[PDB]
C-alpha cells in the first residue's frame, strides 16, 4: 500500500541518521571529546582535528558501544 | 498489507533500542567513560558507580549529541 512506501522511507531515514556524516558508509560509533558530537565512524573521526559539527578542537575520540549497533 | 506490519515492527524495535536501559522512558544521551557503554539517559547515568553492562568503574559520564535525538 502507500503506507508501506511511507514506512520504508521512515526506516531509511532513521538508518541514514545512524551512518557517519563524513563517509556515509559506516555506522556512527565515535564521540568527539569534550564537545560530545557523536556523528562519525572511527576512521573518519581519527582524521579530524576539529569537530565537523561545532569546530571545537578534538582532545580525543571516545568509542561508543550503542544498543542499535548492527553487523554482517 | 502484511509487509506494512513487518516495517512497523522494525521501526518500533529500532526506536526502543534508543531508550535508556534503566528507566525505559528517556532517550540514551550519556556514555560511561572509559568503557564506552552508551545505554542510559543523563539522570540514570548520574549515580551509577560501575557500568550496568560490563561492571567497569565509571570514571566520568560524557554527554553525547546524536543525530537521532528527537525528544
Ligand atoms: Zn566515516
Ligand atoms: Zn562538536
Ligand atoms: Zn533513564
Ligand atoms: Zn561498560
From Swiss-Prot, chain A:
Substituting residue 22 to R results in: Inhibits LDLR degradation
Tissues/organs with expression: Ubiquitously expressed.
Q: Where in the cell is it found?
A: Cytoplasm; Cell membrane
Taxonomically, the superkingdom here is Eukaryota
Which stretches does the entry tag as region Critical for homodimerization? Answer: 64-66
- Tell me, how does this one assemble? Homodimer. Interacts with the E2 ubiquitin-conjugating enzyme, UBE2D1 (via RING-type zinc finger). Interacts with myosin regulatory light chain (MRLC) and TMEM4.
Q: According to its UniProt entry, what is the function of this protein?
A: E3 ubiquitin-protein ligase that mediates ubiquitination and subsequent proteasomal degradation of myosin regulatory light chain (MRLC), LDLR, VLDLR and LRP8. Activity depends on E2 enzymes of the UBE2D family. Proteasomal degradation of MRLC leads to inhibit neurite outgrowth in presence of NGF by counteracting the stabilization of MRLC by saposin-like protein (CNPY2/MSAP) and reducing CNPY2-stimulated neurite outgrowth. Acts as a sterol-dependent inhibitor of cellular cholesterol uptake by mediating ubiquitination and subsequent degradation of LDLR.
Report the protein name in the record: E3 ubiquitin-protein ligase MYLIP
Amino acid at each position: 500500500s502507500q503506507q508501506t512506501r511511507v514506512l520504508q522511507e521512515k526506516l531509511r531515514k532513521l538508518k541514514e541518521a545512524m551512518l557517519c556524516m563524513v563517509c556515509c558508509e559506516e555506522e556512527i560509533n565515535s564521540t568527539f571529546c569534550p564537545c560530545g558530537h557523536t556523528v562519525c565512524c572511527e576512521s573518519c573521526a581519527a582524521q579530524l582535528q576539529s569537530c565537523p559539527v561545532c569546530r571545537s578542537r578534538v582532545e580525543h575520540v571516545q568509542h561508543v558501544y550503542l544498543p542499535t549497533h548492527t553487523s554482517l
